[PDB]
C-alpha cells in the first residue's frame, strides 16, 4: 500500500 | 491485471508463457507488486516490470520496502534487473547488496539459472537479506 522504511540508524 | 493483459505486455518477449506464468505467481502472493509496461533506457525499449512493495520484517516490525523488478525479454533464462525505489519519506542505503544507483546485487541473481531460479525464490531471498540489512531508512 504505502512504502515504509525503518528508522534512521 | 488479468492474464490476458499480461500476455499483451510481453508480446515481444522470447519466452512469453513462462514470463506470464511466473508473473501471475508473484502478483498472487505479493499483492502490492504491480506489472507495468514502461520504456527502459530508450523510448522504443519497452519492458514489463513488477513495481511496488514487499513485506520485510526488521528489528521487530514489518516494512513495505519499495522495489522494481525489470524482466528482460529473455526472462526466465536471464535474471531480472532489480532496484530499490525510495520515496520522499526515506533514503536509500548504499551497501553490500545495493549500489549507488539503487541496483540490487545478490548471489541469487549472480548465479541465476532457469528453471531452479525464479522470481518467488528471488523475493524470498530479498525478504531475508533486507530483513538483515534494510536497503532504505526513513528520514529523521
> Helix (H, G, I), strand (E, B), or coil: what is residue B119?
helix
Exposure b/e, B25-62, CB count within 10 A at least 16 = b: ebbeebeebebeeeeeeeeeeebbbbbbbbebebeeee
Compute CA B88 distance to the chain's CA centroid, rounded to the nearest angstrom: 20
CA dist B82 to A7, B26, B85, Å? 23, 15, 10
CA dist B136 to B32, B67, B97, B100, B105, Å? 18, 10, 12, 12, 15
Question: Which residue among A2, A3, A8 places its CB closest to the CB of B139?
Answer: A8
User: Residues of B with CB below 8 A from A1's CB?
Assistant: 32, 53, 64
Question: What's the length of chain A?
Answer: 9
Distance CA B64, CA B85 (A): 11
CA pseudo-torsion sign B14, B85, B134, B60 = negative
Quick check: B53 contacting A, CB < 8 Å?
yes
Quick check: B130 contacting A, CB < 8 Å?
no
Are the C-beta atoms of residues B7 and B37 closer than 8 Å to each other? no
Distance CA B81, CA B70 (A): 5
CA dist B137 to B20, B28, B51, B87, Å? 33, 27, 19, 10
* Right CATH for B1-140 from 3.40.50.300, 3.90.25.10, 3.10.110.10, 3.40.50.1390: 3.10.110.10
Residues 1-9 of A with CB under 8 A from B: 1-9
User: Residues of A with CB below 8 A from B63's CB?
Assistant: 4-6
Exposure b/e, B85-106, CB count within 10 A at least 16 = b: bbeeebebbeeebbeeebebeb
Place of cell 512504502: A3
> Helix (H, G, I), strand (E, B), or coil: what is residue B8?
helix
Domain boundaries, chain B: 1-140
User: Residues of A with CB below 8 A from B67's CB?
Assistant: none
Are the C-beta atoms of residues B71 and B23 closer than 8 Å to each other? yes
Q: What was the structure determination method?
A: X-ray
Amino acid at each position: 500500500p504505502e512504502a515504509t522504511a525503518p528508522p534512521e540508524e | 491485471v488479468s492474464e490476458s493483459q499480461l500476455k499483451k505486455m510481453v508480446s515481444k518477449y522470447k519466452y512469453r508463457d513462462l514470463t506470464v506464468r511466473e508473473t501471475v505467481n508473484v502478483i498472487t502472493l505479493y499483492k502490492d507488486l504491480k506489472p507495468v509496461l514502461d520504456s527502459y533506457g530508450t523510448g522504443s525499449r519497452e519492458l514489463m516490470n513488477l513495481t511496488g512493495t514487499i513485506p520485510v520484517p526488521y528489528r521487530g516490525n514489518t516494512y513495505n520496502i519499495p522495489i522494481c523488478l525489470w524482466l528482460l525479454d529473455t526472462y526466465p533464462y536471464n535474471p531480472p534487473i532489480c532496484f530499490v525505489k525510495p520515496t520522499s519519506s526515506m533514503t536509500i542505503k548504499t551497501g553490500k547488496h545495493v549500489d549507488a544507483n539503487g541496483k540490487i546485487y545478490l548471489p541469487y541473481l549472480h548465479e541465476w539459472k532457469h528453471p531452479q531460479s525464479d522470481l518467488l525464490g528471488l523475493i524470498q531471498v530479498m525478504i531475508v537479506v533486507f530483513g538483515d540489512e534494510p536497503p532504505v531508512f526513513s528520514r529523521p
